[PDB]
Chain length 493, copies 4
Amino acid sequence: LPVLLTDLKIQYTKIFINNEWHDSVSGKKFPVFNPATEEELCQVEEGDKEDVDKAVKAARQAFQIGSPWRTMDASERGRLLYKLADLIERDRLLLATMESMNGGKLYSNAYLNDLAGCIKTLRYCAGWADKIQGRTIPIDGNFFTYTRHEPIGVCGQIIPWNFPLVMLIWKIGPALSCGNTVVVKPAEQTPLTALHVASLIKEAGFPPGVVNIVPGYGPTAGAAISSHMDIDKVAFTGSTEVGKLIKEAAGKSNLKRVTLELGGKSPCIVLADADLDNAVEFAHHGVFYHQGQCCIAASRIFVEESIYDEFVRRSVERAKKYILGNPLTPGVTQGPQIDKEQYDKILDLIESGKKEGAKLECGGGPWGNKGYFVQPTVFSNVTDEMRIAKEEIFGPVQQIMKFKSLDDVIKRANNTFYGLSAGVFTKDIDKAITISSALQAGTVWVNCYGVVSAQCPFGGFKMSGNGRELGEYGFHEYTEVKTVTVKISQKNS
Amino acid sequence: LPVLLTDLKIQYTKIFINNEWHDSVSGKKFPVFNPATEEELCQVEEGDKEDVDKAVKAARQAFQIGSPWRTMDASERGRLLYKLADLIERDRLLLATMESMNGGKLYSNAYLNDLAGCIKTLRYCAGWADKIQGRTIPIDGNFFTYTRHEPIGVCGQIIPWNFPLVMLIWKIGPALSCGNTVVVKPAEQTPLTALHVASLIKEAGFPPGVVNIVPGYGPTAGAAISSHMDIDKVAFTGSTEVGKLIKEAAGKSNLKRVTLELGGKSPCIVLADADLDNAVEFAHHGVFYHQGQCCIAASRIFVEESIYDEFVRRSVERAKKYILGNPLTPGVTQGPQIDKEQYDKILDLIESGKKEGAKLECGGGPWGNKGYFVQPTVFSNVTDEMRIAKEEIFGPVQQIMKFKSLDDVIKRANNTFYGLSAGVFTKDIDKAITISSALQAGTVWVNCYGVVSAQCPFGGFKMSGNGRELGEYGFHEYTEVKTVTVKISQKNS
Amino acid sequence: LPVLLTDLKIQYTKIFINNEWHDSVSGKKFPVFNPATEEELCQVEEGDKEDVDKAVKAARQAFQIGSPWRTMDASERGRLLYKLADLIERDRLLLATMESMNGGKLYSNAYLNDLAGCIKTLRYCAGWADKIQGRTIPIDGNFFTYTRHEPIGVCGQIIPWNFPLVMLIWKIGPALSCGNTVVVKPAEQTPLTALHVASLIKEAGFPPGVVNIVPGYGPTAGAAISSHMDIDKVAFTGSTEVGKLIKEAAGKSNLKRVTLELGGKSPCIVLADADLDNAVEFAHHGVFYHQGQCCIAASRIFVEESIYDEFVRRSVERAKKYILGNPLTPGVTQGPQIDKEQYDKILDLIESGKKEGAKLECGGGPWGNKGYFVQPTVFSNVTDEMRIAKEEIFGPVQQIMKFKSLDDVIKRANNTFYGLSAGVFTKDIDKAITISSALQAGTVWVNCYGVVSAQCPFGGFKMSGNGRELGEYGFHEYTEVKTVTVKISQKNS
Amino acid sequence: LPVLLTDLKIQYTKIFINNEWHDSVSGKKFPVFNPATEEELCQVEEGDKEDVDKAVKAARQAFQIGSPWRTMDASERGRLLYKLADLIERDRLLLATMESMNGGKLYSNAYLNDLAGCIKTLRYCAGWADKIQGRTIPIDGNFFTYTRHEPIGVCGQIIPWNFPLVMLIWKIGPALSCGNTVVVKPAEQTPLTALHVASLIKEAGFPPGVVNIVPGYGPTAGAAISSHMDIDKVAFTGSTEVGKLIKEAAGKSNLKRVTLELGGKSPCIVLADADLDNAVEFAHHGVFYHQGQCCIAASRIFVEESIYDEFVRRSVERAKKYILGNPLTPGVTQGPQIDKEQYDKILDLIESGKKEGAKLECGGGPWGNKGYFVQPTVFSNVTDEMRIAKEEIFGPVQQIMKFKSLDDVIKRANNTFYGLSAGVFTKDIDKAITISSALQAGTVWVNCYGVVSAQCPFGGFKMSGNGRELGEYGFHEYTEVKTVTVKISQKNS
Ligand SMILES: [Cl-]
Ligand SMILES: [Cl-]
Ligand SMILES: [Cl-]
Ligand SMILES: [Cl-]
């Protein structure tokens, strides 16, 4: 684990349109903070409806038939993505520092697990550019029919604060591989890594207006993207609550395509026959990764009666080993929550857990005089009606529940409006396949948890989302299928 | 062309739930009319929110893990669809009579071209059932990853009045092939063919609750489907206006998946070098098919200056050969419009054409003392700002425009919020491929028009729709992709 | 299980070319026998090089550009295959009687498991006809590129005697779905079911010369097919020995495509943790199905030391329950071997087992005064150097071996030139995936054996074959991929 | 076009096994010559059966389950191929010099068109590594079925002399992307570029024994590869004559998989309506590229009567503009033939052309006192029975034929045992699609010729080959499809 040997100087703070840096139309700026110390890092230009309109006009111009981006070979789009990957790899130390410092993310994890996922996912997306293929079709009658997988057009992409750099590349990588142009709105909490990457898109040599990055607030710049009459598709990751507003505003405007990656209340099911140490470690890392600020957090762990007491005991032993502090300091194993709103929501939900009669095993309160830190918390004897079993906490809070009947636990696991992910722990082949078939969740891990890679599609059932990201399947939602049917004199097979 | 040798008796008039016939919860009924004579055909049970709730509970029960529909082999779902196709083939005379009598559709076309498309599309969909495959994925790390293409769940399907039986099978065929259960709402104008087909689903031997058909009105039963908290996906075909309300209500409720097939203002481009008789006949059949009540109607025909006068002349000759009357009577070549609302809208738009200074060449008025008949109408010298060049008419009204520059005409062809289809007429290979690449339309025909078959995907760009129906690609929107990742000791390639 | 209420009269005995019945050019005939009674059933026309030349000329004429078979829609090829399936279903009683009577196959199995597999596989193949698609390709430069999946041409298909009707449909079903024409050579032992099916191809209404069936001997008619200068592809199932001669003669003639499905020496591996009764029953049915005359026969069963004695004991109990006799008689549970050559080879190998020091547990000799019956035989304490552990027996002879180390048993399982199939019996998820990855075999069953269905590809590694039959993947070997690259003025993505 | 500013020193001359340099077992060496000057360049180690056996043992060891090559992630195989591409890009000057100097290839073309194709194809193949996917299958019964696309094993690859570096990467790129190990035998005329690339495979960091390169002669080392009992697949490009021996020896040994890319006698068809200057230039470059030493050489150009005389005239004008000499010297536009055997064969065929009564238009003889140079030659009034219209010349010799009827010319175009490629020149959409459908050729160019790119499959019909290289489709022949079927308690859709 190497480290940045100079204190970080932030450089890129402006709106990025046509490969140039712009002040806001209003002239307004907004502050960005470090959540470990609550002190200002810099001022960033505040985009609004007028700035989004300028970015969309630039993206539409770069998408015109006969433009550089539309005329270059599919393989050359790939080359630009692979070139950008090499530049992200070059700037890995300073991007991981900026991610840790701005996002409150453990530095070790930002360097070894977020930036490695950024580089790997970009390289994977580069590889698809010239392998996106349509079909030739043996239609009835004297016709020759084929499909083009065309790009859709201008794609509006709203990035969340929990994985700012990883989620930026999960959106722009497929969008640009398929040949779209993008208007990106990074989260108000975390604009800084997206603007550094804009500087690298210019350096990699993308044509101007292919990538535009407009920082700003959700109700202003985000609503402007969702309601715009010339954006063809909107991708949003964030709260289920705002997801509903994005899909509403797409209907009311121009029936733009909507993909959503939203909250979860993801179950683990640990059967009597499971390797108990393997299940304790994966369900633990499942919930406590990045201070529980993961959509896939393993927030409901159901354990069979016979091993329940031993599971809880070993879970609590593991949760009492954390060292809280600034996530840039060596030895620190848990950083802060992102902001006051999230911190308040987490402590409010912990208080309902205690009050509604869950057993607090450890933690259960704040830590420190500055920074938004929550002690890692474990609740046992949780029941399905409690707020901590129904609502996404998005904090370091583990819920452990008891079951006896496998039919019953799958009913309880599925009794939610969420459906992003699930974990099943068993030694048995039949149980692995039948429980993974029965759970209404987009990702099932068996005997592991939180294993996410570029080659696999990822996304929610039910109110956890619409559509899928990455893998073969994820590139479908950034193309538009065009059928071409040509009359010919006589068809021959 | 055989004919039904007995006058039609209508039998199935009720709500279809769990393979049984139900009265409405309210007790209410609504009338169904013949649009050629304006006389009542029968009374049909009026479904509302209470009837949709009962149908969705039946569909959810039939979709439960361990149910008959979920446990039967993929090949057996196929067998039931192929069996249903054979029963539709058996009842082809009485279904085509009912389609003609209720929908105002020429009998020849209902028998030879709608019922043949119904049978062919069902047989095609049957064939996909056991060939829908997921992926095994070479993920990084010591894991085995695969995808299931699972069914989504309960699918709400709202059928339009223009192609009642064809659009019913385009929706239920893919939905049932992929293993979903369905709640169908046929159009208030045209419920009768959908309820006959419900009787054949029961006879084919589908498990109860797999198909439920709730007739009723759009603002009541249709809004109940779009806003329901336990419908997983809604498919709608109809006006762009109602499409916007369906996608809005999906956002506000449960982020259900939304596919839309909406209006068009579809261009033909006829170049100087085109086979002129071939282009006149296809652009003519393109606009006048089923009294212009096609989403793909060729409602803007752009013709190069040098051949423009000859095109208009030959077009008008062709349009003056029609014989209006009851669409069941032999020799009749144009039937009525569906209802008074549509008839009024068409005559109102024809009046704007005359007033705004388009040249009326023929027709331009109503016909007859009963039935909603419009004379087939041709306008020449149409300009892009006129109401008849901007708004979907959905009537027998042809617009013919002039151009000189190919760059310019593609700009004008693309200057619309619609984008369902386009036709290009040329002898030149370069022009066929480059114009089909440049037009922002989901289907391009070259040297033909209106050629639609089960093997090809069909759907809109822009406000003409979201997603695609039929072909390989159309089945993607009735599956939910589930990733399963299993930890293993050591991976080997 | 219904039965044919009349004694069978054989009708179709001639060469089938251009939908007409031909005598042999030589005038020669050959006898066909019942292997349960060794008495002649009928005389069949003996095809040779002159008869194959006539069939190939008819198949080439039916494959010409502009012919009925080449001009009909892909969906219509499908319709003819689905129509043929319905006629096979109609003649199921008499085809299963003919299969049992001529092939020595248990009637129950011929009716309930071979004819059901014939009908199911044909219906599956029908479904692919209009879904075989090529690609549109985003090639570098100003070009439009696509692929056609064309048919290859005239396909020579040599059918074995062990599954005469099932293997006929596994060959003609994919070949005709992809639009090829066929020259079929059924096995000299078993021509009768193939000629009945020829009568049904004529009745279904295939164009003449699309299917031609030339009965005869392997060294004459079979060698004529493999060496012919105008056959584009040869498919052969049979002995590894003749497989080598077919692929040699394809090289020496016209580099025709060769697919081979050949012998096996297929292992089961039964781990200590396996459900022992489930493993005994599946490994038993695995080896004794159709008197061991299966390429996939489970002819080497490796059992972990700790459960070995109990496995052998329960295996021998199961093998002593068989009732030998005519396979048409109710209650009979084992029929005869096909002919004297096979019968002699089986008894010769049983004698090596005894002599080389394997422990005979039961059987080990002939049965009866007529018919080619072998007692069901079990050998325990078999070692890897014995002839019965190295050579394909193709008779009712089970070998049971001991192991202690899992690393070691997979080495021993893979130490063969064969590689058609394998079975793994375990409760453990890790062991199922890692052992299936490590075994060099085309089909792995886990916790079952001999489960073969139309939706899955099937075929050998190593000397058990080249290429694959059925599933998506199997249709690749009956198409020829044609790339078409067209110059265009400017490409746009 | 940069140039190498130092005279080339050759370094790598030995057999490459396990990432180390070996002398031949025999101790024997063979000379390598420059064909422009006929002088020796160096001595290279002569591999035989003993050296191939050592390489295959190393390749089998590197392919063992649990080895570094088998355990590394699919994405890491990709990374090694992309790393190798960057090292080939670094050594582009010295590889293009070595290609020109050893192969007799124009330096401009070796640098700008062969090394660019090498780099582009490797980068494309890298991109497939982690996107090669099998299937999950909805099989009948209570089973879970999937496929692995496994690597086949040890792949023997015989490279021709005409495109030594390009054809090396077309073979090793797909083979290594799919995870196979390789034993390469470069052509005896041209070993030097393959051994330089071996040095770069070691440097890129491939595990030892994954790539082994054994230079030597065709009858010794090539026959050893084709007959070896532990090579799983053999790929050969070269003469149709040797192709037949390779496929024969695969049958007689171990039924190893055989892919062949062989000769052609490729037609162009130029219709009356074609852009004549575009057709003259592409048919010219089609035949004269790399001194006609292309399998796809446009060796039969059929021109419609009305434009025939003008075509021949403009063709001869173009062919008289060449400047012969050493292919490293600036300004030179045609290099030598490869060796004396090829040179003699070309002059012998030119003499038959004159004698059998073709009209010699230009050239028709040797040039120079050293080097194997042939004057660029044009024949008009060629008929289908002449040796120059039937036999592959593999020299700079253009044949131009007359036709009147389009039905007739396609018959004549198809009347050959060859079928690698074809060119069609027309302005008409119908003619482009119908003539490309009718020609029995693996690649059809329309209005261009010789356009070959990594994204497209390439390969022959008939005796021009078995199987396909590059594109999606080409990777199928370097995987082995393994079906895995697992018994489960109850299946749910
Ligand atoms: Cl998928
Ligand atoms: Cl598609
Ligand atoms: Cl497969
Ligand atoms: Cl392909």
